[PDB]
Design an enzyme around this catalytic site. Sequence first.
Site, PDB file in Angstrom:
ATOM      1  N   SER A  70      37.316  23.944 -62.819  1.00  0.00           N
ATOM      2  CA  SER A  70      38.455  23.471 -63.572  1.00  0.00           C
ATOM      3  C   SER A  70      39.206  24.606 -64.231  1.00  0.00           C
ATOM      4  CB  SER A  70      37.931  22.582 -64.692  1.00  0.00           C
ATOM      5  OG  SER A  70      39.065  21.974 -65.344  1.00  0.00           O
ATOM      6  N   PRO A  96      37.666  29.585 -74.744  1.00  0.00           N
ATOM      7  CA  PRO A  96      36.385  28.995 -75.126  1.00  0.00           C
ATOM      8  C   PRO A  96      36.526  27.865 -76.065  1.00  0.00           C
ATOM      9  CG  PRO A  96      36.687  31.151 -76.210  1.00  0.00           C
ATOM     10  CD  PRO A  96      37.735  31.025 -75.085  1.00  0.00           C
ATOM     11  N   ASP A  97      37.676  27.818 -76.703  1.00  0.00           N
ATOM     12  CA  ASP A  97      37.930  26.780 -77.689  1.00  0.00           C
ATOM     13  C   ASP A  97      38.629  25.579 -77.092  1.00  0.00           C
ATOM     14  OD1 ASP A  97      38.199  29.581 -79.621  1.00  0.00           O
ATOM     15  OD2 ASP A  97      37.073  27.848 -80.400  1.00  0.00           O
ATOM     16  N   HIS A  98      38.632  25.480 -75.755  1.00  0.00           N
ATOM     17  CA  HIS A  98      39.292  24.418 -75.049  1.00  0.00           C
ATOM     18  C   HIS A  98      38.667  23.106 -75.504  1.00  0.00           C
ATOM     19  CE1 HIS A  98      40.826  21.824 -71.968  1.00  0.00           C
ATOM     20  NE2 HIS A  98      41.458  22.799 -71.335  1.00  0.00           N
TER      21      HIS A  98
HETATM   22  N1  NAP Z   1      38.587  15.093 -63.360  1.00  0.00           N
HETATM   23  C1  NAP Z   1      39.552  16.042 -63.405  1.00  0.00           C
HETATM   24  O1  NAP Z   1      40.768  15.846 -63.660  1.00  0.00           O
HETATM   25  C2  NAP Z   1      39.095  17.440 -63.020  1.00  0.00           C
HETATM   26  C3  NAP Z   1      40.021  18.531 -63.239  1.00  0.00           C
HETATM   27  C4  NAP Z   1      39.692  19.807 -62.882  1.00  0.00           C
HETATM   28  C5  NAP Z   1      38.470  20.084 -62.288  1.00  0.00           C
HETATM   29  N2  NAP Z   1      37.566  19.000 -62.067  1.00  0.00           N
HETATM   30  C6  NAP Z   1      36.293  19.264 -61.411  1.00  0.00           C
HETATM   31  O2  NAP Z   1      36.482  19.259 -60.064  1.00  0.00           O
HETATM   32  C7  NAP Z   1      35.274  18.732 -59.358  1.00  0.00           C
HETATM   33  C8  NAP Z   1      35.515  17.482 -58.540  1.00  0.00           C
HETATM   34  O3  NAP Z   1      35.946  16.449 -59.450  1.00  0.00           O
HETATM   35  P1  NAP Z   1      35.691  14.912 -59.123  1.00  0.00           P
HETATM   36  O4  NAP Z   1      36.169  14.046 -60.240  1.00  0.00           O
HETATM   37  O5  NAP Z   1      36.215  14.534 -57.785  1.00  0.00           O
HETATM   38  O6  NAP Z   1      34.110  14.863 -59.206  1.00  0.00           O
HETATM   39  P2  NAP Z   1      33.109  13.609 -59.500  1.00  0.00           P
HETATM   40  O7  NAP Z   1      33.627  12.815 -58.378  1.00  0.00           O
HETATM   41  O8  NAP Z   1      33.357  12.411 -60.289  1.00  0.00           O
HETATM   42  O9  NAP Z   1      31.599  13.963 -59.197  1.00  0.00           O
HETATM   43  C9  NAP Z   1      30.740  15.007 -58.716  1.00  0.00           C
HETATM   44  C10 NAP Z   1      29.915  13.822 -58.489  1.00  0.00           C
HETATM   45  O10 NAP Z   1      28.803  14.989 -58.671  1.00  0.00           O
HETATM   46  C11 NAP Z   1      27.361  14.532 -58.416  1.00  0.00           C
HETATM   47  N3  NAP Z   1      26.191  14.949 -59.297  1.00  0.00           N
HETATM   48  C12 NAP Z   1      26.070  14.944 -60.707  1.00  0.00           C
HETATM   49  N4  NAP Z   1      24.843  15.331 -61.124  1.00  0.00           N
HETATM   50  C13 NAP Z   1      24.136  15.591 -59.956  1.00  0.00           C
HETATM   51  C14 NAP Z   1      22.755  16.020 -59.724  1.00  0.00           C
HETATM   52  N5  NAP Z   1      21.872  16.229 -60.741  1.00  0.00           N
HETATM   53  N6  NAP Z   1      22.392  16.192 -58.372  1.00  0.00           N
HETATM   54  C15 NAP Z   1      23.279  15.959 -57.368  1.00  0.00           C
HETATM   55  N7  NAP Z   1      24.579  15.542 -57.504  1.00  0.00           N
HETATM   56  C16 NAP Z   1      24.964  15.372 -58.827  1.00  0.00           C
HETATM   57  C17 NAP Z   1      27.555  13.152 -58.751  1.00  0.00           C
HETATM   58  O11 NAP Z   1      26.664  12.192 -58.139  1.00  0.00           O
HETATM   59  P3  NAP Z   1      26.933  10.505 -58.251  1.00  0.00           P
HETATM   60  O12 NAP Z   1      27.975  10.102 -57.224  1.00  0.00           O
HETATM   61  O13 NAP Z   1      25.529  10.034 -57.957  1.00  0.00           O
HETATM   62  O14 NAP Z   1      27.375  10.207 -59.672  1.00  0.00           O
HETATM   63  C18 NAP Z   1      28.863  12.893 -58.110  1.00  0.00           C
HETATM   64  O15 NAP Z   1      28.758  12.862 -56.682  1.00  0.00           O
HETATM   65  C19 NAP Z   1      34.211  18.702 -60.540  1.00  0.00           C
HETATM   66  O16 NAP Z   1      33.434  19.833 -60.680  1.00  0.00           O
HETATM   67  C20 NAP Z   1      35.064  18.441 -61.743  1.00  0.00           C
HETATM   68  O17 NAP Z   1      34.412  18.804 -62.962  1.00  0.00           O
HETATM   69  C21 NAP Z   1      37.869  17.705 -62.430  1.00  0.00           C
END
Ligand code: NAP
Length: 253
Positions: free
Chosen positions: A133, A139-141
Amino acid sequence: SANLPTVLVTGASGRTGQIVYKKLKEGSDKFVAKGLVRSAQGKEKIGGEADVFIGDITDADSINPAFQGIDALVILTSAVPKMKPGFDPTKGGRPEFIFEDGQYPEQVDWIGQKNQIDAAKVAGVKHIVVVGSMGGTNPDHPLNKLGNGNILVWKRKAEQYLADSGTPYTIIRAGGLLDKEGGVRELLVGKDDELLQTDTKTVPRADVAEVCIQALLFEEAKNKAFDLGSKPEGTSTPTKDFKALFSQVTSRF
Ligand SMILES: NC(=O)c1ccc[n+]([C@@H]2O[C@H](COP(=O)([O-])OP(=O)(O)OC[C@@H]3O[C@@H](n4cnc5c(N)ncnc54)[C@H](OP(=O)(O)O)[C@@H]3O)[C@@H](O)[C@H]2O)c1
Protein backbone atom coordinates in the site's frame (compact mmCIF):
# COMPACT_ATOMS: atom_id res chain seq x y z
CA SER A 1 13.56 -25.83 -18.30
CA ALA A 2 12.46 -24.59 -21.71
CA ASN A 3 9.26 -24.96 -19.67
CA LEU A 4 7.00 -22.00 -18.81
CA PRO A 5 7.53 -20.66 -15.32
CA THR A 6 5.38 -21.92 -12.45
CA VAL A 7 3.89 -18.83 -10.71
CA LEU A 8 2.49 -19.30 -7.17
CA VAL A 9 0.10 -16.56 -5.95
CA THR A 10 -0.64 -16.39 -2.23
CA GLY A 11 -3.83 -14.96 -0.80
CA ALA A 12 -5.36 -16.48 -3.92
CA SER A 13 -8.93 -16.15 -2.77
CA GLY A 14 -8.53 -12.62 -1.66
CA ARG A 15 -10.09 -9.88 -3.86
CA THR A 16 -6.96 -8.92 -5.73
CA GLY A 17 -5.36 -12.41 -5.46
CA GLN A 18 -8.26 -14.24 -7.11
CA ILE A 19 -7.81 -12.03 -10.23
CA VAL A 20 -4.11 -12.78 -10.44
CA TYR A 21 -4.90 -16.43 -10.01
CA LYS A 22 -7.48 -16.23 -12.75
CA LYS A 23 -5.13 -14.30 -14.99
CA LEU A 24 -2.23 -16.74 -14.54
CA LYS A 25 -4.71 -19.52 -15.52
CA GLU A 26 -5.79 -17.63 -18.70
CA GLY A 27 -2.17 -16.93 -19.54
CA SER A 28 -1.50 -20.63 -20.28
CA ASP A 29 0.87 -19.67 -23.07
CA LYS A 30 3.10 -17.85 -20.55
CA PHE A 31 2.64 -19.34 -17.08
CA VAL A 32 1.76 -22.38 -15.07
CA ALA A 33 -0.58 -21.20 -12.28
CA LYS A 34 -0.45 -22.28 -8.67
CA GLY A 35 -2.22 -20.69 -5.76
CA LEU A 36 -2.27 -20.77 -1.98
CA VAL A 37 -5.27 -20.01 0.10
CA ARG A 38 -6.14 -20.18 3.75
CA SER A 39 -9.30 -22.36 3.59
CA ALA A 40 -10.99 -25.14 1.77
CA GLN A 41 -13.75 -22.52 1.41
CA GLY A 42 -11.32 -20.24 -0.42
CA LYS A 43 -10.10 -23.12 -2.64
CA GLU A 44 -13.61 -23.88 -3.91
CA LYS A 45 -14.26 -20.17 -4.38
CA ILE A 46 -11.59 -19.93 -7.04
CA GLY A 47 -12.44 -23.22 -8.67
CA GLY A 48 -11.15 -26.13 -6.54
CA GLU A 49 -8.48 -27.05 -9.09
CA ALA A 50 -5.55 -29.22 -8.14
CA ASP A 51 -3.06 -26.35 -8.46
CA VAL A 52 -4.59 -24.63 -5.47
CA PHE A 53 -3.16 -25.46 -2.09
CA ILE A 54 -4.64 -24.62 1.37
CA GLY A 55 -2.37 -23.39 4.12
CA ASP A 56 -1.62 -20.58 6.60
CA ILE A 57 1.33 -18.34 5.77
CA THR A 58 2.27 -17.99 9.47
CA ASP A 59 2.59 -21.83 9.77
CA ALA A 60 5.90 -22.37 8.03
CA ASP A 61 5.85 -26.11 7.34
CA SER A 62 2.20 -25.86 6.36
CA ILE A 63 3.07 -23.78 3.31
CA ASN A 64 6.04 -25.77 2.05
CA PRO A 65 4.10 -28.01 -0.36
CA ALA A 66 2.84 -24.96 -2.24
CA PHE A 67 6.32 -23.57 -2.69
CA GLN A 68 7.85 -26.69 -4.19
CA GLY A 69 9.29 -26.22 -7.63
CA ILE A 70 7.90 -22.68 -7.99
CA ASP A 71 9.81 -20.26 -10.23
CA ALA A 72 7.97 -17.07 -9.29
CA LEU A 73 5.88 -15.93 -6.31
CA VAL A 74 3.24 -13.13 -6.20
CA ILE A 75 2.52 -12.25 -2.50
CA LEU A 76 -1.06 -11.01 -2.11
CA THR A 77 -1.73 -11.85 1.56
CA SER A 78 -2.65 -9.22 4.16
CA ALA A 79 -3.74 -8.82 7.74
CA VAL A 80 -7.38 -7.70 7.78
CA PRO A 81 -8.99 -5.75 10.62
CA LYS A 82 -12.68 -6.46 11.47
CA MET A 83 -15.01 -4.02 13.16
CA LYS A 84 -14.94 -4.73 16.92
CA PRO A 85 -18.64 -5.62 17.60
CA GLY A 86 -19.27 -3.00 20.32
CA PHE A 87 -20.02 0.21 18.37
CA ASP A 88 -22.97 2.44 19.15
CA PRO A 89 -23.31 5.30 16.72
CA THR A 90 -26.08 7.46 18.14
CA LYS A 91 -23.88 8.95 20.87
CA GLY A 92 -20.94 9.70 18.63
CA GLY A 93 -17.69 7.80 18.81
CA ARG A 94 -16.03 6.07 15.86
CA PRO A 95 -15.77 2.29 15.47
CA GLU A 96 -12.65 0.50 16.64
CA PHE A 97 -11.36 -2.35 14.56
CA ILE A 98 -9.58 -5.46 15.74
CA PHE A 99 -7.28 -8.20 14.49
CA GLU A 100 -7.84 -11.75 15.68
CA ASP A 101 -4.97 -12.80 17.98
CA GLY A 102 -2.15 -14.30 15.92
CA GLN A 103 -3.63 -12.50 12.88
CA TYR A 104 -2.22 -8.99 13.32
CA PRO A 105 -0.01 -7.23 10.78
CA GLU A 106 3.19 -7.97 12.69
CA GLN A 107 2.43 -11.64 12.45
CA VAL A 108 0.88 -11.77 8.97
CA ASP A 109 2.43 -8.89 7.01
CA TRP A 110 5.91 -8.91 8.47
CA ILE A 111 6.71 -12.43 9.94
CA GLY A 112 4.08 -14.03 7.69
CA GLN A 113 5.53 -12.50 4.54
CA LYS A 114 9.01 -13.36 5.80
CA ASN A 115 7.71 -16.96 5.97
CA GLN A 116 6.79 -16.86 2.35
CA ILE A 117 9.87 -15.15 1.09
CA ASP A 118 12.05 -17.59 3.12
CA ALA A 119 10.28 -20.63 1.61
CA ALA A 120 10.35 -19.32 -1.89
CA LYS A 121 14.11 -18.80 -1.44
CA VAL A 122 14.59 -22.38 -0.13
CA ALA A 123 12.63 -23.61 -3.19
CA GLY A 124 14.72 -21.60 -5.59
CA VAL A 125 12.16 -19.10 -6.88
CA LYS A 126 13.55 -16.63 -9.41
CA HIS A 127 11.30 -13.54 -8.95
CA ILE A 128 9.12 -12.47 -6.10
CA VAL A 129 6.36 -9.85 -6.57
CA VAL A 130 4.57 -8.40 -3.51
CA VAL A 131 1.57 -6.06 -3.30
CA GLY A 132 1.35 -3.46 -0.54
CA SER A 133 0.00 0.00 0.00
CA MET A 134 1.00 3.63 -0.51
CA GLY A 135 1.47 5.59 2.75
CA GLY A 136 4.55 3.94 4.01
CA THR A 137 6.71 7.01 3.80
CA ASN A 138 4.79 8.47 6.81
CA PRO A 139 4.97 6.48 10.08
CA ASP A 140 2.24 8.59 11.48
CA HIS A 141 -0.18 7.52 8.76
CA PRO A 142 -3.70 7.00 10.24
CA LEU A 143 -3.93 3.43 8.89
CA ASN A 144 -1.24 2.33 11.40
CA LYS A 145 -3.68 3.09 14.18
CA LEU A 146 -6.29 0.69 12.75
CA GLY A 147 -6.58 -2.14 15.30
CA ASN A 148 -3.36 -0.74 16.84
CA GLY A 149 -1.59 -2.82 14.26
CA ASN A 150 0.88 -0.50 12.49
CA ILE A 151 -0.04 -2.34 9.27
CA LEU A 152 1.94 -0.08 6.87
CA VAL A 153 5.05 -0.23 8.98
CA TRP A 154 5.15 -4.08 9.15
CA LYS A 155 4.39 -4.30 5.47
CA ARG A 156 7.23 -1.96 4.66
CA LYS A 157 9.53 -3.97 6.95
CA ALA A 158 8.77 -7.05 4.75
CA GLU A 159 9.27 -4.96 1.57
CA GLN A 160 12.77 -3.98 2.80
CA TYR A 161 13.50 -7.59 3.77
CA LEU A 162 12.47 -8.65 0.27
CA ALA A 163 14.52 -5.95 -1.45
CA ASP A 164 17.48 -6.80 0.73
CA SER A 165 17.34 -10.60 0.19
CA GLY A 166 18.97 -10.61 -3.23
CA THR A 167 16.11 -12.45 -4.93
CA PRO A 168 14.80 -10.47 -7.97
CA TYR A 169 11.82 -8.57 -6.56
CA THR A 170 9.03 -6.10 -7.52
CA ILE A 171 7.25 -4.10 -4.74
CA ILE A 172 4.02 -2.50 -5.86
CA ARG A 173 2.50 -0.09 -3.35
CA ALA A 174 -1.05 0.27 -4.39
CA GLY A 175 -3.19 3.35 -3.98
CA GLY A 176 -6.79 2.95 -2.73
CA LEU A 177 -8.18 -0.20 -4.29
CA LEU A 178 -11.23 -0.21 -6.57
CA ASP A 179 -13.67 -2.97 -7.54
CA LYS A 180 -13.72 -0.94 -10.77
CA GLU A 181 -13.18 -2.35 -14.22
CA GLY A 182 -9.64 -3.35 -14.96
CA GLY A 183 -7.78 -2.67 -18.24
CA VAL A 184 -9.99 0.36 -18.85
CA ARG A 185 -7.81 3.05 -17.23
CA GLU A 186 -4.54 4.72 -17.87
CA LEU A 187 -2.39 3.46 -14.95
CA LEU A 188 0.25 5.55 -13.14
CA VAL A 189 3.45 4.67 -11.32
CA GLY A 190 4.90 6.84 -8.58
CA LYS A 191 7.66 7.04 -6.05
CA ASP A 192 7.53 7.60 -2.34
CA ASP A 193 3.81 8.48 -2.08
CA GLU A 194 4.01 11.43 -4.48
CA LEU A 195 0.68 10.30 -6.04
CA LEU A 196 -1.07 11.01 -2.70
CA GLN A 197 -0.74 14.71 -3.75
CA THR A 198 -2.92 13.99 -6.82
CA ASP A 199 -6.49 12.99 -7.75
CA THR A 200 -5.12 9.83 -9.40
CA LYS A 201 -4.34 7.85 -6.26
CA THR A 202 -6.76 4.87 -6.44
CA VAL A 203 -6.56 1.87 -8.77
CA PRO A 204 -8.77 -1.04 -9.92
CA ARG A 205 -7.93 -4.32 -8.15
CA ALA A 206 -7.93 -5.83 -11.64
CA ASP A 207 -5.21 -3.39 -12.80
CA VAL A 208 -3.11 -4.22 -9.64
CA ALA A 209 -3.54 -7.94 -10.66
CA GLU A 210 -2.43 -7.14 -14.30
CA VAL A 211 0.61 -5.12 -13.15
CA CYS A 212 1.72 -8.14 -11.01
CA ILE A 213 1.52 -10.39 -14.14
CA GLN A 214 3.40 -8.03 -16.49
CA ALA A 215 6.10 -7.59 -13.81
CA LEU A 216 6.79 -11.27 -14.47
CA LEU A 217 7.50 -10.68 -18.19
CA PHE A 218 9.95 -7.76 -18.15
CA GLU A 219 13.50 -7.69 -16.79
CA GLU A 220 12.73 -4.02 -16.14
CA ALA A 221 10.20 -4.93 -13.39
CA LYS A 222 12.90 -6.68 -11.44
CA ASN A 223 14.58 -5.04 -8.39
CA LYS A 224 12.01 -2.27 -8.55
CA ALA A 225 9.77 -0.66 -5.94
CA PHE A 226 7.02 1.75 -7.03
CA ASP A 227 3.56 3.11 -6.15
CA LEU A 228 0.53 2.39 -8.38
CA GLY A 229 -2.37 4.71 -9.16
CA SER A 230 -4.53 5.38 -12.24
CA LYS A 231 -6.96 7.78 -13.97
CA PRO A 232 -10.75 7.10 -14.14
CA GLU A 233 -12.45 5.15 -16.94
CA GLY A 234 -13.62 7.26 -19.85
CA THR A 235 -11.05 10.08 -19.37
CA SER A 236 -7.99 8.70 -21.09
CA THR A 237 -6.35 5.73 -22.82
CA PRO A 238 -5.74 2.41 -20.95
CA THR A 239 -2.12 1.36 -20.45
CA LYS A 240 -0.49 -0.90 -23.09
CA ASP A 241 3.30 -0.35 -23.20
CA PHE A 242 4.35 -2.23 -20.08
CA LYS A 243 8.11 -2.28 -20.82
CA ALA A 244 7.89 1.54 -20.91
CA LEU A 245 5.89 1.66 -17.73
CA PHE A 246 8.46 -0.30 -15.78
CA SER A 247 11.32 1.58 -17.41
CA GLN A 248 9.94 4.66 -15.62
CA VAL A 249 10.96 3.14 -12.32
CA THR A 250 14.48 3.38 -10.99
CA SER A 251 13.97 2.94 -7.24
CA ARG A 252 15.19 -0.24 -5.59
CA PHE A 253 13.11 0.69 -2.47
N1 NAP B 1 -8.08 -2.16 0.51
C1 NAP B 1 -7.42 -1.14 -0.09
O1 NAP B 1 -7.95 -0.10 -0.56
C2 NAP B 1 -5.93 -1.36 -0.27
C3 NAP B 1 -5.14 -0.24 -0.72
C4 NAP B 1 -3.80 -0.37 -0.94
C5 NAP B 1 -3.17 -1.59 -0.74
N2 NAP B 1 -3.96 -2.70 -0.31
C6 NAP B 1 -3.32 -4.00 -0.13
O2 NAP B 1 -3.27 -4.63 -1.33
C7 NAP B 1 -3.41 -6.11 -1.16
C8 NAP B 1 -4.62 -6.71 -1.85
O3 NAP B 1 -5.79 -6.12 -1.27
P1 NAP B 1 -7.18 -6.90 -1.25
O4 NAP B 1 -8.22 -6.10 -0.54
O5 NAP B 1 -7.58 -7.36 -2.60
O6 NAP B 1 -6.82 -8.09 -0.27
P2 NAP B 1 -7.79 -9.01 0.66
O7 NAP B 1 -8.60 -9.46 -0.47
O8 NAP B 1 -9.07 -8.67 1.27
O9 NAP B 1 -7.03 -10.27 1.25
C9 NAP B 1 -5.77 -10.95 1.26
C10 NAP B 1 -6.68 -12.02 1.66
O10 NAP B 1 -5.28 -12.48 2.34
C11 NAP B 1 -5.32 -13.86 3.00
N3 NAP B 1 -4.69 -14.15 4.36
C12 NAP B 1 -4.77 -13.44 5.57
N4 NAP B 1 -4.11 -14.05 6.58
C13 NAP B 1 -3.58 -15.20 6.02
C14 NAP B 1 -2.79 -16.30 6.58
N5 NAP B 1 -2.44 -16.34 7.90
N6 NAP B 1 -2.43 -17.32 5.68
C15 NAP B 1 -2.81 -17.27 4.37
N7 NAP B 1 -3.56 -16.29 3.77
C16 NAP B 1 -3.92 -15.27 4.64
C17 NAP B 1 -6.73 -13.87 3.29
O11 NAP B 1 -7.38 -15.16 3.39
P3 NAP B 1 -9.08 -15.32 3.48
O12 NAP B 1 -9.66 -15.21 2.09
O13 NAP B 1 -9.14 -16.70 4.09
O14 NAP B 1 -9.59 -14.23 4.41
C18 NAP B 1 -7.27 -13.29 2.04
O15 NAP B 1 -7.16 -14.21 0.94
C19 NAP B 1 -3.26 -6.26 0.41
O16 NAP B 1 -1.97 -6.49 0.87
C20 NAP B 1 -3.82 -4.97 0.92
O17 NAP B 1 -3.39 -4.68 2.25
C21 NAP B 1 -5.31 -2.59 -0.07
